[PDB]
């Protein structure tokens, strides 16, 4: 017959009870055998009638009382069941168990009334979520965020979560701590954000090689445009992943394209690593430079020229880089690097900050339109507060700098929040003019001479001219080279300066390529203090008039002088097929200097309002434009499928590593078909394409897994957050996903890789002393292949523990470790 025995779960399996690897949650729901609204009549539940576990079971009698008090005070009161503000206000943990259970049961009758009345379990679900916030232990605050609202947990071994155990999880094995013999050193930390991937696990190291091979043959393998294949990689968070994968990538690329011997093969398959840690340059040089080091001159440029106040001296442009350019007259000595003006987190770190100013640390509703309108408005002004000063001047330095592959930002050529390449920025004309000038003029040795604290003269001596004294070996020697004068003081006094152009440029006329005026810059010398053409003296000295200007384009001075010519000229050095050093992959020389990278995306790039607006489609239309500007290499956005609730949909919140978009379901950039056509369009114009490869993290994995966690710092060592900490805690983290792409293409090309390139899976990795393992294919990511996750806003108190101290467990289909053990109220 009927009774309170029907609070029992219909059956004790996954069919009737919510569980994550057999373990119950207070957020979790279950199907009781029967429910009741009065206490007299009990109706046997159907498989449509589920109820939350927090109605029946609680962590402690304190929370049982607080659950009763909250619900009653939030419109679940009924004096016909002795439930009113007053009747439940005096109850505490010291109240009798036999008493509280009567009140909790009487409340459970009143909740069943609301479910019928409201005709759903939606307000109940809403009220449970709101109650959990009031209880500090069940709340999302229990996982201990730091003062900045950030943090991370590490996945550790445990008897309860033995499936999620790992022999590896070698954390912060980065740069020069690959061996783990300087954990406290200059290595770079493991955790950034999202679910951190364990790149120390040999199976994951094999999956990375599979993933690289897929991208290097994307067009052919997917049956799209067969020339739609990536030639290299932009390596995301290279300083925050086991450096074994940087070695293994270098091995694969050398095996496939034979780059070690031939600089031409090397340069045609360009790879560059995100991370400016000086230890990275040291590490890469020692290995023979498998990838290009990220230079920090972009930070120097923003400090010297970029700021409104507090501008660092002009001499920092000489020394504030991995390469010293006081008198750089040598080749194959400088660290092979890739530099820029606009840092890759710069726009984000400015726009974010402009939000928390407008709305002070308030809930993040998308008023980024406001922040961007403020940015665009500020950008046009002379007296800027937010946007960079001297943007043209910063690029003039970058594009004239020897021993670097310069990288242009899409957002500096175009308004990056407008539809892709619809609106040019005010700095388009300036930067594009300097870009074309680079291909024609910029070559030979470099000398950056300080004329004052605020003024500098960066001179290039032209192709086949080693230094100031050189005659000139090449036939373009005489009619190539450049002088880039940059003042960072807008109240600098009018004065005449002397610039040593070199012995090869004695009694030679020089065109006024670019000069400053009251309004901005002039390309025909109109408005400037210097005429269209000046001639050098007998010793090759140029007399230039300079003064301090203050306009939207220049806060100081900018002047560029190139030799007078009759013809189109191209000072690109062709790479040899026999290297000076056979130990090296990449060498900082005229051949590598001839290259120029282009970041083809912004984070704040908008969703396309049609197929024509797809970035891939527009890139394919303007392949020859990029070629005209002198762009050789194309850094393409991470083209992977994204977390639907990601802020930007930028590509770094990767949900499927092999799904690059379909005709019906494209990314923000477009479909895989369009990507392949975009890559082929660039290839057609003699350009190469590098893919943004995100081996560090994955974000938005929909499958939850019961994992054991410890609150750790961003290196993976346990940390104490304002006195509090926790280790060996149950955590229902989102660990499991990958999509059909990881399922379909997961370790599917390892057979082919092992047949053609056996050395890949025999070569012992430094961090493990063990080769990558291709015997297991990763078709679905889980905790076992992960170091940890950034705090997921869930809490550490959800795991249901019985009065005896043991976790509540179910012996489900796959869940079969220990014996079934449910709370008293659910059996």
Give the interface with Na ion as residue ranges (CB under 5 A). Answer: 190, 196, 240, 696
Residue 788 C-beta: closest distance to Na ion, Å: 9
Q: How many CB atoms lie within 10 A of CB 258?
A: 13
3-state helix, strand, coil in the chain (%, to 5): 30, 20, 50
Q: How many CB atoms lie within 10 A of CB 745?
A: 22
Q: 273: part of which helix (H) or strand (E)?
A: strand 271-273
Q: Which token pair is 530? A: 């210097």
Contact, 403 vs 328, CB < 8 A?
yes
Q: Judged by CB, which is closer to Na ion: 243, or 504?
A: 243
Residue 391 C-beta: closest distance to Na ion, Å: 33
Contact, 219 vs 678, CB < 8 A?
no
The DSSP 8-state label assigned to residue 371 in this structure reads: H
Spatial distance between the Cα atoms of 53 and 723, rounded to a whole number of angstroms: 32
**Among candidates 563, 572, 560, which has minimal Cα distance to 627?**
572
Q: Judged by CB, which is closer to Na ion: 240, or 439?
A: 240
Spatial distance between the Cα atoms of 354 and 377, rounded to a whole number of angstroms: 13
Q: Judged by CB, which is closer to Na ion: 632, or 696?
A: 696
Q: How many CB atoms lie within 10 A of CB 178?
A: 21
Residue 768 C-beta: closest distance to Na ion, Å: 16
Q: Judged by CB, which is closer to Na ion: 196, or 633?
A: 196
Q: Judged by CB, which is closer to Na ion: 242, or 328?
A: 242
Q: Judged by CB, which is closer to Na ion: 196, or 713?
A: 196
Report residue 372 CA to chain centroid gap: 21
Contact, 791 vs 734, CB < 8 A?
no
Q: Judged by CB, which is closer to Na ion: 696, or 789?
A: 696
Q: Judged by CB, which is closer to Na ion: 188, or 661?
A: 188
CA angle 775, 777, 783 (to 5 degrees): 115
Q: Judged by CB, which is closer to Na ion: 677, or 696?
A: 696
Residue 230 C-beta: closest distance to Na ion, Å: 22
Contact, 186 vs 278, CB < 8 A?
yes
Q: Judged by CB, which is closer to Na ion: 196, or 692?
A: 196
Question: What is the DSSP code string of 168-221?
Answer: ---TT--TT-SSSS-TTSSS--S--SSEEE-TTSHHHHHHHHHHHHHHHTHHHH
What are the b/e assignments for 399-431, b being 16+ CB within 10 Å?
bbbbbbbbbbbbbbbbbbbebbbeeebebebbb
Spatial distance between the Cα atoms of 6 and 34, rounded to a whole number of angstroms: 5
Look at phi and psi of residue 323 and say left if phi exceeds 0, alpha if psi is from -120 to 50, else beta.
beta
Spatial distance between the Cα atoms of 739 and 661, rounded to a whole number of angstroms: 12
Spatial distance between the Cα atoms of 97 and 127, rounded to a whole number of angstroms: 24
Residue 696 C-beta: closest distance to Na ion, Å: 5
Residue 197 C-beta: closest distance to Na ion, Å: 7
What are the b/e assignments for 561-570, b being 16+ CB within 10 Å?
bbbeeeeebe
Q: Judged by CB, which is closer to Na ion: 196, or 244?
A: 196
Residue 191 C-beta: closest distance to Na ion, Å: 6
Q: Judged by CB, which is closer to Na ion: 190, or 600?
A: 190
Residue 763 C-beta: closest distance to Na ion, Å: 22
Spatial distance between the Cα atoms of 77 and 116, rounded to a whole number of angstroms: 16
Contact, 540 vs 461, CB < 8 A?
no
Q: 344: part of which helix (H) or strand (E)?
A: none
Residue 237 C-beta: closest distance to Na ion, Å: 6
SS (H, E, C) 283-300: HHHHHCCCCEEECCHHHH
Residue 339 C-beta: closest distance to Na ion, Å: 25
Residue 21 C-beta: closest distance to Na ion, Å: 24
Contact, 654 vs 641, CB < 8 A?
yes
Residue 248 C-beta: closest distance to Na ion, Å: 16
Q: Judged by CB, which is closer to Na ion: 605, or 696?
A: 696
Give the residue nearest to Na ion (CB): 240
Q: Judged by CB, which is closer to Na ion: 240, or 478?
A: 240
CA pseudo-torsion sign 334, 335, 340, 341: negative
Q: Judged by CB, which is closer to Na ion: 112, or 196?
A: 196
Residue 717 C-beta: closest distance to Na ion, Å: 14
Residue 787 C-beta: closest distance to Na ion, Å: 7
Strand pairing category for 654-656 and 697-698: unpaired
Residue 207 C-beta: closest distance to Na ion, Å: 15
Residue 274 C-beta: closest distance to Na ion, Å: 12
Q: Judged by CB, which is closer to Na ion: 234, or 240?
A: 240
SS (H, E, C) 768-800: CCCCCCCCCCCCCECHHHEEEEECCCCCCCCEC
**What φ, ψ does residue 532 adopt, rounded to 5°?**
-70, -35
Spatial distance between the Cα atoms of 386 and 389, rounded to a whole number of angstroms: 9
The DSSP 8-state label assigned to residue 303 in this structure reads: I
């Amino acid at each position: 017959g009927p009774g309170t025995w029907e609070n029992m779960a219909f059956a004790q399996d996954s069919s009737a009870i919510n569980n994550i690897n057999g373990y119950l949650s207070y957020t979790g729901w279950y199907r009781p055998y029967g429910t009741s609204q009065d206490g007299k009549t009990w109706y046997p539940t159907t498989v449509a009638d589920w109820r939350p576990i927090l109605m029946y079971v609680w962590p402690s009698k304190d929370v049982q009382v607080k659950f009763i008090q909250y619900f009653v005070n939030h419109g679940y009161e009924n004096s016909n069941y002795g439930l009113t503000a007053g009747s439940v206000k005096d109850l505490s943990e010291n109240t009798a168990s036999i008493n509280l259970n009567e009140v909790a049961q009487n409340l459970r009758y009143v909740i069943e009334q609301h479910i019928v009345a409201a005709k759903s379990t939606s307000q109940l679900a809403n009220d449970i979520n709101n109650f959990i916030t009031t209880i500090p232990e069940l709340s999302a605050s229990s996982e201990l965020p730091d003062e900045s609202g950030y943090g991370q947990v590490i996945f550790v071994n445990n008897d309860n979560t033995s499936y999620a155990d790992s022999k590896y999880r070698l954390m912060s094995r980065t740069i020069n701590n690959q061996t783990g013999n300087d954990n406290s050193g200059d290595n770079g930390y493991e955790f950034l954000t999202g679910i951190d991937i364990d790149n120390s696990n040999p199976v994951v190291q094999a999956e990375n090689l599979n993933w690289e091979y897929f991208l290097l043959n994307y067009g052919k393998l997917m049956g799209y445009n067969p020339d739609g294949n990536f030639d290299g990689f932009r390596i995301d968070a290279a300083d925050h992943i086991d450096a074994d994968v940087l070695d293994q990538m270098g091995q694969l690329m050398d095996d496939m394209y034979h780059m070690k011997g031939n600089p031409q093969n090397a340069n045609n398959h360009l790879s560059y690593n995100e991370g400016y840690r000086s230890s990275a340059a040291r590490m890469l040089n020692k290995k023979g430079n498998p990838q290009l080091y990220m230079d920090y001159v972009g930070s120097t440029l923003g400090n010297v020229l970029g700021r409104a106040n507090n501008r660092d001296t002009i001499s920092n442009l000489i020394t504030g880089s991995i390469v010293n350019r006081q008198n750089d007259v040598t080749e194959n000595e400088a660290t092979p690097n890739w530099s820029f003006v606009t840092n890759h987190d710069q726009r984000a770190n400015l726009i974010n900050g402009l939000i928390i100013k407008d709305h002070p640390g308030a809930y993040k509703a998308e008023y980024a339109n406001q922040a961007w309108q403020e940015f665009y408005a500020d950008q046009k002004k002379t007296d800027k507060q937010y946007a960079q000063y001297n943007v043209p001047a910063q690029y003039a330095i970058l594009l004239s700098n020897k021993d670097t592959v310069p990288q242009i930002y899409y957002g500096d050529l175009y308004n990056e929040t407008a539809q892709y390449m619809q609106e040019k920025s005010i700095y388009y004309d300036a930067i594009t003019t300097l870009m074309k000038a680079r291909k024609q003029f910029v070559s030979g040795g470099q000398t950056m001479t300080k004329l004052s604290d605020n003024l500098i003269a960066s001179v290039r001596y032209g192709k086949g001219v080693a230094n100031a004294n050189s005659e000139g070996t090449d036939s373009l020697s005489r009619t190539s080279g450049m002088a880039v004068i940059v003042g960072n003081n807008p109240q600098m006094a009018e004065q005449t300066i002397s610039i040593n152009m070199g012995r090869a440029h004695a009694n030679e006329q020089y065109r006024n390529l670019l000069d400053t005026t009251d309004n901005g810059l002039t390309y025909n010398a109109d408005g400037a203090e210097n005429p269209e053409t000046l001639t050098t003296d007998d010793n090759g000295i140029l007399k230039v008039t300079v003064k301090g200007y203050s306009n939207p384009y220049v806060s100081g001075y900018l002047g560029v002088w190139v030799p007078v010519v009759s013809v189109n000229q191209d000072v690109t050095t062709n790479a040899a097929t026999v290297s000076a050093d056979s130990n090296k992959i990449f060498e900082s020389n005229a051949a590598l200097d001839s290259h120029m990278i282009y970041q083809d995306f912004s984070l704040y790039q908008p969703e396309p309002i049609s197929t024509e607006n797809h970035a891939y489609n527009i890139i394919a239309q303007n392949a020859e434009l990029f070629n005209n500007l002198g762009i050789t290499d194309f850094w393409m956005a991470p083209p992977y499928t994204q977390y639907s609730e990601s802020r930007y949909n930028d590509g770094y919140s990767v949900t499927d590593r092999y799904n690059l978009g379909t005709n019906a379901n494209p990314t923000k950039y477009g479909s895989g078909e369009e990507l392949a056509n975009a890559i082929a369009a660039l290839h057609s114009a003699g350009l190469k394409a590098q893919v943004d490869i995100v081996m560090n993290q994955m974000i938005g994995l929909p499958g939850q897994e019961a994992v054991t966690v410890t609150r750790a710092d961003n290196r993976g060592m346990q940390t104490d957050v304002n006195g509090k900490t926790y280790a060996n805690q149950m955590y229902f983290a989102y660990t499991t996903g990958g999509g059909n792409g990881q399922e379909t293409y997961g370790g599917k090309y390892l057979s082919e890789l092992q047949s053609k390139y056996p050395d890949l899976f025999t070569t012992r990795a430094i961090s493990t002393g063990v080769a990558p393992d291709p015997t297991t294919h990763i078709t679905k990511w889980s905790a076992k292949y992960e170091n940890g996750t950034s705090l997921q806003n869930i809490g550490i108190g959800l795991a249901v523990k019985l009065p005896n101290g043991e976790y509540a467990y179910l012996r489900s289909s796959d869940n079969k470790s220990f014996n079934t053990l449910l709370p008293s109220e659910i059996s």
